[PDB]
């Protein structure tokens, strides 16, 4: 499932802008 | 079938522009000092600063204060962006925007004092509950559509739409925050900035872009509110961008047909075919099936009952925010970057 893959990726937390 | 509310919106926006230009021309500077506020707790952190809860000592009112390290802003090439942020903030006025109350600077830092929104970030609420229902998502999406209609009429691009930057007030309505990447742009602009998941294809491909990137981010936001995860994700940014530019999106099986149709029109990789950027402009979105039950005036007037109201424990309560490590704000004996921030 796409939900489990989302939880498996490292990007469920607060996301920073790239900045620059 | 009486859309002379169109003429009313047109009249409203013409007036909003007058007000904006008046303030844009004569911007407020240095309206407060650092020791008029009591620093209480960190609400959020970044590469070049932080945001704290503060208490205005005379009045007793709580505010959020953004503190930017001038040296770090220069180091990270954000000087122009911080001047945009302040200048835009002081000139705008809309029900779903956080309000700038004071700004000032000292030897080491820039300071922007603004409304505290005690309900926290949409991000935290969405990650905890998993996903919002379509009515719940639609409630917020309607506010963002009106907000972009306002901002774009004034030639402002926001450029950092995401759940992290949408705070929820005591009545369940959205307060958009972080104008760090907001810019006044007639025609094209070129800076590679934003959050990877929310970057439009034009930005990624370095070709020059316009207000349409915000309508794209809206597609990504509605998707994430309704799905519980974003339409393009991967472990690393590079893989995310490849997905964004591919022209391929998959929708949860539980998405309605109307929502899927809206999102295909918002997530069009070719900006000339994207909702918000066609001949009818924002009206393509407002008149779309998915928003058929939306009372746009009542939402602007805040007369719609919110589907969710955060827990309120009092003024100065921060339980809707995460905890961040605290650091003493030090002000140097010598002025840093005086020329770079002379306009601030
Ligand atoms: C902590 C949550 N937060 C709030 C809150 C309010 N107004 N009430 O509660 N929290 N306002 C934030 C504003 C703002 C603003 C204005 C409107 C002045 O433009 N920028 C935030 O961004 C952070 C994180 C990355 N963007 C940041 C921090 C330091 C340096 C660079 C970025 C976070 C913010």
Short mmCIF file of N, CA and C in Angstrom, two decimals, chain B residues 144 148 158-166 176 178 195 197-199 213-222:
data_model
loop_
_atom_site.label_atom_id
_atom_site.label_comp_id
_atom_site.label_asym_id
_atom_site.label_seq_id
_atom_site.Cartn_x
_atom_site.Cartn_y
_atom_site.Cartn_z
N UNK B 144 -7.90 28.48 1.22
CA UNK B 144 -6.65 28.67 0.46
C UNK B 144 -6.92 29.24 -0.93
N UNK B 148 -5.31 32.70 -2.20
CA UNK B 148 -4.53 32.86 -3.42
C UNK B 148 -5.18 33.84 -4.41
N UNK B 158 3.09 33.05 -3.27
CA UNK B 158 3.34 32.62 -1.89
C UNK B 158 4.51 31.63 -1.81
N UNK B 159 4.47 30.61 -2.65
CA UNK B 159 5.59 29.68 -2.87
C UNK B 159 5.99 28.71 -1.74
N UNK B 160 5.23 28.64 -0.64
CA UNK B 160 5.52 27.61 0.37
C UNK B 160 4.27 27.03 1.01
N UNK B 161 3.28 26.74 0.17
CA UNK B 161 2.07 26.04 0.62
C UNK B 161 2.44 24.63 1.06
N UNK B 162 2.00 24.28 2.26
CA UNK B 162 2.13 22.95 2.84
C UNK B 162 1.39 22.98 4.19
N UNK B 163 0.96 21.81 4.70
CA UNK B 163 0.34 21.71 6.03
C UNK B 163 1.15 22.35 7.16
N UNK B 164 2.49 22.29 7.06
CA UNK B 164 3.37 22.91 8.07
C UNK B 164 3.14 24.42 8.22
N UNK B 165 2.71 25.08 7.15
CA UNK B 165 2.57 26.55 7.15
C UNK B 165 1.15 27.05 7.31
N UNK B 166 0.23 26.13 7.58
CA UNK B 166 -1.17 26.46 7.81
C UNK B 166 -1.51 26.20 9.26
N UNK B 176 -2.64 31.43 7.42
CA UNK B 176 -1.44 31.13 6.64
C UNK B 176 -0.26 31.89 7.24
N UNK B 178 4.39 32.05 7.57
CA UNK B 178 5.65 31.91 6.85
C UNK B 178 5.60 32.45 5.42
N UNK B 195 9.38 23.70 -0.88
CA UNK B 195 9.57 22.39 -0.25
C UNK B 195 9.42 21.34 -1.33
N UNK B 197 8.40 18.25 -2.03
CA UNK B 197 7.09 17.65 -2.28
C UNK B 197 6.09 18.58 -2.99
N UNK B 198 6.20 19.87 -2.70
CA UNK B 198 5.25 20.87 -3.19
C UNK B 198 5.78 21.68 -4.39
N UNK B 199 7.00 21.38 -4.88
CA UNK B 199 7.57 22.12 -6.02
C UNK B 199 6.87 21.82 -7.34
N UNK B 213 2.38 28.24 -10.06
CA UNK B 213 3.01 27.30 -9.14
C UNK B 213 2.25 27.15 -7.82
N UNK B 214 1.54 28.20 -7.40
CA UNK B 214 0.70 28.14 -6.21
C UNK B 214 -0.54 27.28 -6.42
N UNK B 215 -1.13 27.33 -7.60
CA UNK B 215 -2.28 26.49 -7.90
C UNK B 215 -1.85 25.02 -7.97
N UNK B 216 -0.66 24.77 -8.50
CA UNK B 216 -0.06 23.44 -8.43
C UNK B 216 0.11 22.94 -6.99
N UNK B 217 0.73 23.75 -6.13
CA UNK B 217 0.88 23.37 -4.71
C UNK B 217 -0.48 23.11 -4.05
N UNK B 218 -1.51 23.83 -4.47
CA UNK B 218 -2.86 23.59 -3.97
C UNK B 218 -3.33 22.16 -4.30
N UNK B 219 -3.03 21.70 -5.51
CA UNK B 219 -3.34 20.32 -5.88
C UNK B 219 -2.67 19.34 -4.94
N UNK B 220 -1.39 19.60 -4.63
CA UNK B 220 -0.61 18.73 -3.74
C UNK B 220 -1.17 18.75 -2.31
N UNK B 221 -1.58 19.93 -1.85
CA UNK B 221 -2.16 20.11 -0.52
C UNK B 221 -3.50 19.39 -0.36
N UNK B 222 -4.41 19.61 -1.30
CA UNK B 222 -5.71 18.95 -1.26
C UNK B 222 -5.52 17.44 -1.26
#
